[PDB]
Amino acid sequence: NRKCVVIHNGSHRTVAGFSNVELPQCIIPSSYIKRTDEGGEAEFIFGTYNMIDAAAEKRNGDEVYTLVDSQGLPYNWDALEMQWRYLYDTQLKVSPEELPLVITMPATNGKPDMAILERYYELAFDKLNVPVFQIVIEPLAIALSMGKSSAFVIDIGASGCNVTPIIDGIVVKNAVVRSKFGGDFLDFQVHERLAPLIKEKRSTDVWYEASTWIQQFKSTMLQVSEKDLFELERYYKEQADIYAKQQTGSPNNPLVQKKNFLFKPLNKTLTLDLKECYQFAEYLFKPQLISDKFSPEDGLGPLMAKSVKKAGASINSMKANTSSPEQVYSLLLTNVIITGSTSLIEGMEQRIIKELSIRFPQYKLTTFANQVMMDRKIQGWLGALTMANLPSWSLGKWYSKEDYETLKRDRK
Template sequence: MAYTSPAVVIDNGSYTTKAGFAREDLPSLVFNSNYMVNPETQAVIVGDDALEANCQNEVMTLLDNGLIYNYDNIIHNWQYVYDNIDNHNPIDAKEYPLVLTEQSWNTPQNKVTTCQIVFESLEVPIFSLVKTPIAQLYRAGKSTGLVIDIGSSVTSVTPILDGIIQQKSSYHSKYAGDFLNLHVLNYLESKTPFNNLIPAQFAHASDSFKHYYASHNILQEYKNLSISYQIKSYQLYNHENINVQDQRNYLENLFDPTLNKLPNVTVPEPTLDKPGSHGLTNLVFLALKNLESSLLPSSNDTTSQNKFARFIEIFKELLSNVFITGGTASANGLPDHIINDLRALTQKYFPNYPFSYAVQQIRPNNTENSETWDRQFGAWLGACNLASMLNDHNEDSNSAKIALDNWFITKADYEELGEDLIVEKFK
């Protein structure tokens, strides 16, 4: 059965929500994932312009550690998509398939709660949860690869073999874009008071709004300018110029989170039993070492020798398909830094295997803008590719059936089979 209506695809990130129809080349909606509640009417406020217009209210979050935790209000985020997706005209959720992305460490209970909302409250006809790294790698045209995703709130390292996430060798940490923002803010506050960073029109805004605005505007703009153009001064809204020639390369904090101290922020010393306490290079190393221990045969008989040859083949393919993605990964020079570190890692810690020469970064598109879009919207674009299979009307193709059998749950199946079907289909 092929569907005629295009799927609605929503990628909820901690920083922004990306949404649009699966047939589109880029998401038609990119808006802040935070929200407010009007204290008088209890109405939920969503959308960049609406947040600014109500700046006196507190700004609240929907995600933590890359996962939705605020299920009481996530439906308002999704409803905002349905109300605005068609050139800011509403559509009926009952008439369109829905695809959401999820992190690979999402919990079974979260999956069940998500399905309850989309089927019972939104009443969508058919639904899928697509794992973010799978969508990103699929977008790159690969089924095996090492996905390094550096987003706003989370950095993750995910080995994928033949389309299967190696969960026990997948790690993530909170040393990502927001962590860099803390260093940038600390630096700017050493030059000028925090309130000087905020436009005068928001002088009486709530503290949470001021910090939200600084993060999504000033800090983001400053990072983009200073990394891409090595600026010597930065102009504030009040036309004050800050001399930034003595700035440090704060990207290094991704690789060594303990490098520069932050006031009132305790960064724990990294330990082997807590992968999330490590910087980016060590996070990749721990993922590869764990994968090695799970794949490497322990004996030297003929069968093990064949397995060893297969192990070498798998690692070479994995390391020749390194996909670096996420909004923070757009920082100038960061991908090359990661690849160089990865080559050095394999030479130092895997000297008996011919891996180092194989380390290569996947670039889905050759043009600079396309690469930027793929980093920012890779998960959304990959999920669109999978969702588009539902609309395949080619009689010689089984794409629609494959999608329905493997990745989607219909409302009727949900009502009949419930939680067991969700856990099995989206495991």
């Protein structure tokens, strides 16, 4: 009753802390280092620090593993137990069996896995033996914490883009869309494109780079163009041309402006022009530009529109309750919650707005994006904390004529 323990296991971040404080106690990487020692014991190493210090040690026995798959679900449960025990014993400094526990599961189109729920119940009750235990749906908690019963949640994380429409507080499962192109993808592309400029055990090193200079490059150098990048190249080229023609940088062509990034490991300047920065994030919207599995329909825009129309068509399985598909559209598009760390790149929200408006003209677009960066990165955990402090209100069940009718049939 006094406080809950709140834990969110993301594909990148793990956020933990008591429900009675707004700021989390811990934010650690979901990845961890497993170290087979010369002492004879297997040691687990959690935390951006500690993991970085260890990666610095360059011990051969060190291997970095992931705790959460690209689906947002835990795939390594012994390691998850180890992390939870780390958070409980050394950080929160409380016995698991003392307080309740609130965790996060991502929104899924199909009926929830009772396998991983059995895994959660086995972890929480059998091993750590927590007295009470609750699971919340991340984008749903996010919507509830903002008081939006109807919400269109675009969450751009490291795993990909997770799109979750919500109408009247229910998740609308069959309209849930997950993308393959997130912040990890960007990590890889940054490494690839910047590789030539750098060139002229391993896993801990790959990690280390992803958590240091790559991260800084993403948070500083990456930007999203307000519209299609090629069209914008054309536009800025022609506009640049026509304004000097009335007969050392150019103010009418922003795409050729030099931007400088200090690459610390080699202590050398990496110079790119604004176009080349735009390209990285542009891959999220036009994935076809990198390779082919990737249909243009795998881009953020088509996926968003797809989710919207899917939610629209799906809401009629309820018989529509009005006297409506276009109306649910308007409803989703008027409550758009943009969240996720990757969504903090400079031009994301405006580009998402553009992409939604060109595919839904004659609609009113209203988007909400938390301007507090730390908050946008941990929004789901914050929502979970909100739900954790809710009262245990015993709300009257609704009751359908069919709910009474099937019982009336089971009597006979």
